[PDB]
Amino acid sequence: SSNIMLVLRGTLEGHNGWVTSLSTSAAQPNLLVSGSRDKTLISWRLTENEQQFGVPVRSYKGHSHIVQDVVVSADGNYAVSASWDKTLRLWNLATGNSEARFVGHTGDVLSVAIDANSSKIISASRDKTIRVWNTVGDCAYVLLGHTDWVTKVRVAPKNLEDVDDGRITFVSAGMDKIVRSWSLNSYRIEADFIGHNNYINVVQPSPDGSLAASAGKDGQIYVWNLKHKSAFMNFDAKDEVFALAFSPSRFWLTAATASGIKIYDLENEVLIDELKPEFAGYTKAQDPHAVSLAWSADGQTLFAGYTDNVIRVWQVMTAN
Template structure:
């Protein structure tokens, strides 16, 4: 299999600038933030709300939780995400649909487009990112029974000098943002494979990156115990934590950071090895609430599609569910082993956790595990293969899982089909 390997020239990488006080508003100059003024390609702003795709096959019925049921679930009935659930068929389950091979080391993150376009981007400890074409699955010759090459890598993005720890996509699917142990963030034009921006400012490994809903702001988290807010020109506009960031920051590595999709309450959520989850007001970068309860370092944090719920997990093997609007703990879910990644289903009332033992999928109404996905190959005592990262397709039909053996396994919901 052949790849297109690119480490192209950098287009317009301005020096890093820090400015303002905690009340400094983060902004991007007018025009396309990702390109020089003479470029004709533009970034489409994110839509104000996610447009639910049309489904065919087994119908998915929405219903409102009665107040008693909401109370017994530990959920407040006011949030749309808490009130609405999808009742899938009793026989509905995730089945292995294929395996994708291309990375030479641990897969660290997977990014999927919000419009369900047939591609994904993955990052790895092999210091590269891969752009995968999902339009042409082929039967694979493999030791794995009935395995299919679900997609093929058609472009490898290189340039980072250390492990690539995280990757996310802009809402129009034209750009990828990566964070690496080399201390840098990079913005990639996926149509050319070229780095268009480098973000330099962290003193240690970058562990997590995220785009705001409107693509105009970027947040990063690092082993240097700071969270940085950037515009898309590569300028650091504010630093939370560290020597210059005030006393509200984390006291350990900041392992994960996410924007809330709730436009009415702009929020950043961060997780740390100091065992806490912190919720920040995006308008002034001030701490809104400090969420405590974990018994070990926190690896992962995820925000529900409507921005009302937050899930966190890590060393203690327990997932904690939080009410973001009220800043309080709702309940806990026991995963039984270290949690490496968390993600909410976009259209089912499910929370998925990548753990040291398996992928666990909880129904948040019943709090029961509805499925426990384990690698389909035998694992010896000297060989640990486990899931490190998870991402759902936008239509909720497919779960992509990255593993320590460098593969991406694809799980499809049986009986589900997507009508584009």
């Protein structure tokens, strides 16, 4: 069932380091902000004309070191960048200048999260801590509880929780081999998740916000319930799964293995498609793996940022 084929449609050249992270806003479907190892963000405008799927719009210089995680705002006009210089930068997606410079992490920041609304900034850093900031730039909360580095923090979207609660729930993980849930208003702990043999490389809550997918070094992908606080399922990728991403339309998990990109069909608990682009002049032992994954707003296109300094887009083209 669902004989869905996805084919590479364009390549977004222009970066100069590994495209570490990607982000897309639901409101604005034709804009894509990508941060790379070249210490710069790039805003891409997507064109449905010919070979190139997008067009770079603005490069955001101002970061001294590696840019790890990139998050766009809900409205699609602001972008928060986490870099390896222990600082966070807020950028106006049109002006190109920085608005706020969040400072306070003693270790280089690895991930950043946007609030459901435009209120709070959640940042994870190597200093074993999480920081909650306002949009102005000051740090409101210093959440502890992790004894090692925290690599990924992405907010669980509130779908239909009771009506309304004014409570902000997200997850956090890193080299502590644990996954933690946090609730904000106040701004304290929630349930835990201990399933990983090795340390967690990346976590990503489902678009609805009730499934949390975590991945690690051993390629052991775990899927948990947050609102139920229980395990949902478990698979093995048998490679290095660098990044993973849910899909808005389909019930799918893209996983960036060290060898290629797997897609897991969640309802059938079986992988369906594998993505391995064709490079040239290599030795098949160091083919550029994927480090960043991001689906489109609808769930029609997939953006993958590789170590070959390239964004490649796979458009879903169901060949019957």
